[PDB]
């Protein structure tokens, strides 16, 4: 096993500056065939490696050129003349002479910069959602990690639109928005109030502090109302059955499928039935959640049987009791018929 | 009316880089803030930067300096966010929104949105397969290759344990020189790299798993002649574990239609563990799908279908596909569901 050893462990440089690193190898890395396959390197924090030299000194196309490879035998050289802010990460030499193929240690190149900053501001708002009536007067909260005196605003999300600003610099209601909106507070606590809940109000809402750059958003707080009408009339399910496919039969299992779909209310009954024998214990169910739209249910039944006991039987049923049918429906298929 | 009218939806690989632009109309542009922010599917707000189009001062967040550029053409009104070097989760919803007059600290006026996809599929070399999997056990990779003469490339996989270095793992010659393959010492015996050249693949069966396998995977294609190049995959976490129940893809069956209203569907089987996210059409197909939540089965894994009505007119001509994705063990599957034709 050829070794490869890398100095320095790591190194930083302001941002501009050059870095050099150097690899050493425990035999020569020269080829029969009289090249080096010696090559370079760079892992960015969190990604793939990338390639930049190969044979020593080549660049792999668009490897630009401050990139620079040197060195002969079992001493090798990476050069970055100007390390720029991409640039940072490990860096590793490797090597394609002699099997087993191996790479070196790595040296991580990083950016010093004296000047530490302050930190960004972070925006946490509460509750994370909230359910609520119409009329209702609901009140949610914002907390700032610094004080941001006044410099906040309050913003309205409905799914697939864009947001919608409701109130600028912590109390100022904008042009057009209703006046159930209003927001109070200052420095580091914030509190956005909708007087009377109304049926349009059911969306995101998110804080936004305008101090300082960057400028920064909260994580949101959901505001639903569940409804409060009657029932939906009743809807029957329509029903299919499917037979196993022959993909699926290659692998010694059949499931039959048996949907009922779009009905109310929830209560149903599936029965599966094998040449006519009623079935028990190796199916399952399972249920959608109640419609957002239309609030019916969807329902799947499925039948597991091995493939020799699928073949040995002609006809499957799923039989489907639900109260808008007038009587039980049969829906079936006949093995190997079309 | 005041508005911002943004330019379309845009898919687009990763390294590369987006281009959108933003019209203003009803209004004086160059008297007012522009900014740029994004939400991530599922996720919040993010402020890029800011450019004031009467001066083109900028102001950019640190995470985007030297990778955001905000540009305005002010003969047409129109404000400009290139982004270069795109990753993974650059993915998002582009806005760009005007603030309210004499400051530019809040957001008035904004835009509908731009969708900026990465797409995962547009790469040179990217992996499926991984997870969890318990000592002594097998597990197997795959790479798809796209974009270069696979068959001339010398293909390898490496590996990194966590805070590691790169060790090299396996390599697979070219037809000329008889497909033949080669091993790190650790892993002969125990690992095997094959190709199929027909299919742009590459693979790792990885038999006998210990713990020090544990290390994220990265498929590797290399080239020297007179165009060279040495190409990585994006990684994938194989953990060697015996505290965790063991990761397995799914496998998808076609629930073909019958032979008004038609039925179909994908039947979702035997993966672990939970989720999967199944779509019809890339996207396309949305209304009347119900996915049903999965169920444990005695085996010890999920199975759950997705059906979608639609009317049969449509069982000619629509073509029907849905769409699996198994983050936990980096697989996806299409199947088309067509009617059985005898």
């Known amino acids: 096993d050829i070794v490869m050893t890398q100095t320095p462990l790591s190194l930083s440089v302001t941002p501009g500056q050059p870095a050099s690193i150097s690899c050493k190898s425990s035999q020569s890395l020269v080829h029969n065939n009289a090249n080096t396959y010696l090559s370079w390197y760079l892992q960015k924090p969190g990604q793939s490696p990338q390639s930049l030299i190969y044979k020593v000194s080549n660049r792999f196309s668009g490897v630009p050129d401050r990139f620079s490879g040197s060195g002969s035998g079992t001493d090798f050289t990476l050069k970055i003349s100007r390390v720029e802010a991409e640039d940072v990460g490990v860096y590793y030499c490797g090597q394609g002479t002699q099997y087993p193929f191996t790479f070196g240690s790595g040296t991580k190149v990083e950016i010093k910069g004296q000047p530490k900053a302050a930190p960004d501001i972070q925006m946490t708002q509460s509750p994370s959602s909230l359910s609520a009536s119409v009329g209702d007067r609901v009140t949610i909260t914002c907390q700032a990690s610094q004080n941001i005196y006044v410099w906040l605003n309050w913003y309205q999300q409905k799914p697939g639109k864009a947001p919608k600003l409701l109130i600028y610099?912590?109390?100022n209601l904008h042009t057009g928005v209703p006046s159930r909106f209003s927001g109070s507070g200052s420095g580091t606590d914030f509190t956005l109030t909708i007087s009377s809940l109304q049926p349009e109000d059911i969306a995101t809402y998110y804080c936004?502090?305008?101090?300082?750059?960057?400028?920064?958003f909260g994580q949101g707080t959901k505001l639903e109302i569940k409804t409060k009408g009657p029932s939906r009339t009743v809807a029957a399910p329509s029903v299919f059955i499917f037979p196993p496919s022959d993909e699926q039969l290659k692998s010694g299992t059949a499931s039959v499928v048996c949907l009922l779909n779009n009905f109310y209310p929830r209560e149903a009954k599936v029965q599966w039935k094998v040449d006519n024998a009623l079935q028990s214990g190796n199916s399952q169910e399972s249920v959608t959640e109640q419609d957002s739209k239309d609030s019916t249910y969807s329902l799947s039944s499925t039948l597991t049987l091995s493939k020799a006991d699928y073949e040995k039987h002609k006809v499957y049923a799923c039989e489907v009791t639900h109260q808008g049918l007038s009587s039980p429906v049969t829906k079936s298929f006949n093995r190997g018929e079309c | 009316q005041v508005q911002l009218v943004q330019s379309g939806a845009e898919v687009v690989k990763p390294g590369a880089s987006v281009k959108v632009s933003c019209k203003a109309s009803?209004?004086?542009?160059?008297?007012?803030?522009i900014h740029w922010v994004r939400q991530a599917p599922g996720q919040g707000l993010e402020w890029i930067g800011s450019?004031?189009?009467?001066?083109?001062?900028?102001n950019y967040a640190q995470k985007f300096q030297g990778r955001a550029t905000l540009t305005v053409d002010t003969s047409i009104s129109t404000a400009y966010m290139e982004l270069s070097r795109l990753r993974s989760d650059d993915t998002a919803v582009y806005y760009c929104?005007?603030?309210?007059?004499?400051?530019?600290?809040?957001?008035?006026?904004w835009g509908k949105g731009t969708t900026v996809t990465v797409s995962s599929s547009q790469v040179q070399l990217v992996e499926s397969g991984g997870g969890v999997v318990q000592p002594g056990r097998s597990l197997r990779l795959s790479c798809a290759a796209s974009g270069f003469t696979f068959t001339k490339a010398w293909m390898h996989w490496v590996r990194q344990a966590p805070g590691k270095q790169l060790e090299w793992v396996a390599q697979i010659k070219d037809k000329s020189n008889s497909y033949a393959t080669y091993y790190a010492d650790s892993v002969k015996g125990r690992f095997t790299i094959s190709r199929d050249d027909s299919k742009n693949t590459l693979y790792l069966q990885m038999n006998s798993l210990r713990a020090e396998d544990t290390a994220v995977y990265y498929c590797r294609g290399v080239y020297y002649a007179l165009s060279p190049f040495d190409y990585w995959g994006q990684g994938t976490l194989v953990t060697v574990s015996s505290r965790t129940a063991s990761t397995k893809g799914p496998s998808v069956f076609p629930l073909a239609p019958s032979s008004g209203t038609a039925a179909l569907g994908c039947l979702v089987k035997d993966y672990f563990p939970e989720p999967v996210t199944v779509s019809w059409n890339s996207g396309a197909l949305t209304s009347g799908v119900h996915t049903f939540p999965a169920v444990l089965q005695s085996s010890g894994l999920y199975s759950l279908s997705s059906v979608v009505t639609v009317p049969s007119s449509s069982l000619g001509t629509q073509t029907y596909i849905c769409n699996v994705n198994h983050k936990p063990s980096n697989t996806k599957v299409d199947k088309k569901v067509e009617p059985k034709s005898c």
């Open positions: 610099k912590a109390s």
């Open positions: 929104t005007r603030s309210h007059y004499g400051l530019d600290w809040n957001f008035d006026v």
């Open positions: 936004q502090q305008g101090q300082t750059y960057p400028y920064t």
């Open positions: 450019i004031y189009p009467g001066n083109v001062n900028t």
């Open positions: 009803g209004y004086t542009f160059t008297s007012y803030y």
